[PDB]
Ligand binder design. Sequence first.
Ligand SMILES: CC(=O)N[C@@H]1[C@@H](O)[C@H](O[C@@H]2O[C@H](CO[C@]3(C(=O)O)C[C@H](O)[C@@H](NC(C)=O)[C@H]([C@H](O)[C@H](O)CO)O3)[C@H](O)[C@H](O)[C@H]2O)[C@@H](CO)O[C@H]1O
Ligand SMILES: CC(=O)N[C@@H]1[C@@H](O)[C@H](O[C@@H]2O[C@H](CO[C@]3(C(=O)O)C[C@H](O)[C@@H](NC(C)=O)[C@H]([C@H](O)[C@H](O)CO)O3)[C@H](O)[C@H](O)[C@H]2O)[C@@H](CO)O[C@H]1O
Lengths: 485, 490, 490
Amino acid sequence: QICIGYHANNSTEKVDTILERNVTVTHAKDILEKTHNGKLCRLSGIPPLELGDCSIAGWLLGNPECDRLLSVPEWSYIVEKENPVNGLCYPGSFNDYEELKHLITSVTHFEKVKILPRDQWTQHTTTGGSRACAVLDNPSFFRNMVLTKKGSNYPIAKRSYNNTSGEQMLIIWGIHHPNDDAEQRTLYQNVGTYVSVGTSTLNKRSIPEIATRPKVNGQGGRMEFSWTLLETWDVINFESTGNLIAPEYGFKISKRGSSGIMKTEKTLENCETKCQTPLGAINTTLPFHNIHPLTIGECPKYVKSDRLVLATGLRNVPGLFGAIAGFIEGGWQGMVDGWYGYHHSNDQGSGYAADKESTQKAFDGITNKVNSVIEKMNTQFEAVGKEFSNLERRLENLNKKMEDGFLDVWTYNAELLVLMENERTLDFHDSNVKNLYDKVRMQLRDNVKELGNGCFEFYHKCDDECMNSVKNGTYDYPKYEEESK
Amino acid sequence: DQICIGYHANNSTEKVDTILERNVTVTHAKDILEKTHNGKLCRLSGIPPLELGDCSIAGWLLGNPECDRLLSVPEWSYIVEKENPVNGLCYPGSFNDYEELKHLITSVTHFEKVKILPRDQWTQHTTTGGSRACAVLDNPSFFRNMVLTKKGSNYPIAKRSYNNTSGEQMLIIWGIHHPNDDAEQRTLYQNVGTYVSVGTSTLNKRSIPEIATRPKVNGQGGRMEFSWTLLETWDVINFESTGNLIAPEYGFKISKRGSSGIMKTEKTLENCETKCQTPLGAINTTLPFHNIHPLTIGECPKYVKSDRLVLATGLRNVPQIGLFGAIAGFIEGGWQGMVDGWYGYHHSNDQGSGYAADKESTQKAFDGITNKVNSVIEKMNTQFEAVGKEFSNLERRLENLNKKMEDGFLDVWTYNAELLVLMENERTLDFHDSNVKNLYDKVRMQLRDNVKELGNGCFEFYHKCDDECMNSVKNGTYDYPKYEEESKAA
Amino acid sequence: DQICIGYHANNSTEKVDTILERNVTVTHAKDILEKTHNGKLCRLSGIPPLELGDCSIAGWLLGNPECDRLLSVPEWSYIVEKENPVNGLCYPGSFNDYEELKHLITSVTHFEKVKILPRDQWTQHTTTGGSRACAVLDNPSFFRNMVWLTKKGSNYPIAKRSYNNTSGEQMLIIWGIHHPNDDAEQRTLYQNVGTYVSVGTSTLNKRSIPEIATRPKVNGQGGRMEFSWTLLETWDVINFESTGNLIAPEYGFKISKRGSSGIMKTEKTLENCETKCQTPLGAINTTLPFHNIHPLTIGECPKYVKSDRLVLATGLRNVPQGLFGAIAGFIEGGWQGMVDGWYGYHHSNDQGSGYAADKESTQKAFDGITNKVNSVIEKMNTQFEAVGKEFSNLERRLENLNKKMEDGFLDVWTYNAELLVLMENERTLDFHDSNVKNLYDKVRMQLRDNVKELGNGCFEFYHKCDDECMNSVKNGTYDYPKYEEESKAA
Ligand SMILES: CC(=O)N[C@@H]1[C@@H](O)[C@H](O[C@@H]2O[C@H](CO[C@]3(C(=O)O)C[C@H](O)[C@@H](NC(C)=O)[C@H]([C@H](O)[C@H](O)CO)O3)[C@H](O)[C@H](O)[C@H]2O)[C@@H](CO)O[C@H]1O
Ligand SMILES: CC(=O)N[C@@H]1[C@@H](O)[C@H](O[C@@H]2O[C@H](CO[C@]3(C(=O)O)C[C@H](O)[C@@H](NC(C)=O)[C@H]([C@H](O)[C@H](O)CO)O3)[C@H](O)[C@H](O)[C@H]2O)[C@@H](CO)O[C@H]1O
């Protein structure tokens, strides 16, 4: 006789299908990335800027507590602790601050340059500081910033700078808001002052806004900062009748795109990644992951899922077409070089021979299925975490609804795709075995008896040569047409 | 003697579509599209909406006299307004960052007013000033939550502060009055060249009054401009004014339980419960989709632009007087007389005849189709959302972006829903076809040449097959060798 | 004598992909990805775009002399500009909420410039002032819709005028303030120092003071003009008041809107064609659900995907000489000789041979595959959208959010369109394979043992089968008993 059979093994891998849960299969492929390396890493060769617990404002203004910082000239993203300790040491605010953060999120070059040496403010006092910025602990001040009356006069404070640096330049300035009209006169002599800044494209003025306020870092006063991007060869003009907090430096900046800020206590560790999360980096070909929604880089789609396992092998039995676990009741652990094949028995022996033709065709098909699911997934650079101020709650919620919206689409589609394709893979195997069975059946015709269990019992002697012809589709029916029926 | 293989039919006229075929009549079906609502405005997880009627949130917080019996509740999970609330700034003017204020109070768990600046302590200023714009019966009146004009012929500097000892963050509103003319300025405040300043740990503002002729609104060329801040616990707010300050008398303690939204509808609350509210009524469903209204609040099915999503659960209904070729194929029709299963046998022998369901195939199909339905339904994620959003008339672009987002997901879900239904119905009908073909073959491969295939799902035995014999056929233990009585064939 | 079952083949070199297999040649196919356009800028549902060419919207509404008789239409559906317009604020400055204003006039049902404040009626001021920045041929000029108010002799008295919107429609009105480079300039032009510009309607109240400060020369000028706008409601009044530095409108624009749209950037000019879907490369006219022409569309468009190709198999695998084992299986090749159907018979007997399509199964398959193609196309919901948006340089995060949203939908639709094609193509090929298998079994069950089943789709008769008999096989009326007395010899 000769029987048609299929592979079984010792596998305990389970998959789900649209019709059935926890099916054991001989082989399966997990498409959900669940692991990371526990490290903060460089992105495509370039490290993050690490701010420790300094804020971007604290760093750029020169909060004295941010002195021992260490600022690379180039970075691919920014790492901050969740709530930075050192920001505006002299209390106040920073206009369009989240727009500024977004801009410097990834740069190809960054370099501080002295643009308005403080000693050239020759008719104002320049040494003013505050205990709120105290070092050691004498009053001090933002190290990058500088004006009060000299003797008893505050003449117009007017200076300009031409960006001949070769790159666009980031420039910050501020205006001080005193406690009361008496302090206004003490510091700046005149009341009703202004700070004007102008370039070819920016025209901005602030005036002092005096109010009674509780002390913050010991001070009732506030400083309000603003910023601009000065283009190559343009001029910035400062013009103030008082209250100006002038920059001494500006920042040369070249951008190669935008990135984002990552909130984490982790420190850079000298490895390479293409996809960073606050928990660690991911290195994967898989199309989905569930590590963390706030990633930076070229990452798989984040889904709300614990498990996405594609079946690749067949039901492990140690279907639509009725053969596997069907009229062929069980698998063969003894057939090791194929998914499908034969067992024979005659005068010369017995028995297993894998069918390489249908096995290979199936392997190729399932390889294509898997490649299709994984490769079709687009993966461009994105930074998920975003910055919004406390008066942009609606905009932060819009962003959230959008991220939530995409998370629902992808999680549902990923779960359904796996269930549907798993059903079809199981049926594909079932069909391949049925077809191999019928291939034999249709060769033998009435020269053999169809037992009903996968086996054919010949009506003639069928030796090893005969058997081989049955297995490769060249069985000579007329030759044995003598039936003994 | 004979045994026939067949499948259930009934009196169903339910129709489904499939990828390959439209309006296929099936024996059973299940709609996964929620189309009904209860006509009521409900509580959401036990917690009622704040019902503002035709007052705006401004009108309510300021204390527009037309809102007086507003009936504010301690706790709320969303806010209900009429489409265009008529009672707002009774004295005309504006409200800075109003939408962000509306977003913040959309869902709160403790809401309590605190009389932070008792009006009676403004002892050196007049405090009863009012307007016919806010008239009550029909005397001049004013926002009940707000208060300053000269006392006699003097307006001394006005200076008061409040330390938030209330135990929670506090919402505080104040305004400035922009008079129509210098004479109004002098009448009200005596002083000219005035200011209003307010400071906290994080707020710093000084406003100066704008005197200018404007068209009259509710009788007034003057305007009032309001602003708001949240005072942190233990922080201090300081007001100082030489004139034109509209002072708050009250602040509002706010503990937010996340965020929700405002629902525009004419409906009023009705002592019912729900997880998903629409302006037309509440939705109570396990279904993954609905088409009732896009502006929902709660944990809602996905909204789609569809009128019907019907999943086949039973087979093609073929009452008598596919891929596998059995159903409506080599087995011509179904059997209304077989009622205890989807698939089975009809037999005839010396003893009688003869319907019997195949409990194995039938149970397969039950479990499989239940799993399919459960998969399509259970795998859908449903998180809390308030769809309708507030944008000012200078935020059209932002409004349009929200719209583009909502429209985009609507097209995604609608297309995927409709196609999933067509595709799964095709597979379902084929699944049943397969189960019938498999049942037939199970019988055929056992019987081999001890019976003849009579065509139409039937086998005629070449031997006597009593009830005991039939059972062995039906449960798959038939004894071929036992029956060579069979030379009946030859 | 014999009859064989077979299927159509031809010389199609059309390839598709399936989930299991790449580059399969099929007899027939259809792309559902729209890749063509008419290369033209068209009317959108009958209504033309406003064509601004190398002018910006600001250049146009203020009346920059280069945007003068720009030639407008009273109605438009979208606005076309060059990518980088040359003519905008010729006197340098800015426009407050400019993007909101661009978005407002993107689509209008009516638009008409009206003279609301004739410049001759500024009797106490000079009205002819201009700038070399706006030079015409080559005398100083100015924005033609605006009036630069300057002093008359040595005096600038209070400038005060108002206008009542009795036009019957809402009216766009624009005004500006001049921020001089220096005190000398302020005095030469306006005489007074410490001036202001005030503007007020029923809902708007604005006061601005000029900012005198040295700035880099733009178009020769260190001064700047800052513009603002408002919509004046029907029968509302706008009040202008100034002691200097006011740039007054002479005109306003009646506007009626019925929805919004967007700005398209392209060099193309309008060409007298019609469309529902404009791209900057040309208009699309398609029923297809997907396209790859250009992401910045305006209208009701297919979904944009990053696919080069989306080809659905419609015919079967082309095997010029599967789950069900017949096509490219035990029936090893297709027949180029069967031209009148997809599946059929080849017969051979005494009278000759012998191709004939099975009309019924062919037509059933055509109906099925037609429903499948229609399903994929017809279920796609489409709505009006203008993809291209305007954001200022301080709106990068908002611009990034918009981009993330578009990239997100691009990812969803691409992945799903591609996999849908792969998956449905696998099912379409198996559907054909099953149709052939079923036709094959129908012949098998008819002939029974009156014929030899060879195993390659052919049946060899144990009796003589003439054309009449061959025909009964073909149409399901073969008479087994009739030839039983003859067949096999036995
Ligand atoms: C310059 C000086 O010594 N001025 C005396 C003020 O110190 C003083 O009031 C106290 O000021 C305390 C804060 O003092 C500083 C600070 O910020 O540390 C002292 C700095 O030298 C001064 N810097 C200057 C003027 O450039 C800084 C500045 O004035 C303010 O921050 C402006 O808002 O103030 C703190 O405010 C105490 O609450 C306040 O009493 C008054 C009273 O002691 O006399 C001033 O001469
Ligand atoms: C107190 C009084 O007699 N005031 C007379 C002014 O009313 C009047 O100018 C006319 O004012 C008309 C509105 O009258 C009220 C109002 O808003 O109803 C009267 C209110 O008492 C007053 N509120 C106060 C004083 O706290 C209110 C207020 O002054 C304004 O709203 C401030 O903008 O005015 C109306 O607006 C007429 O258009 C206007 O002429 C003058 C001149 O007739 O005499 C005042 O005695």
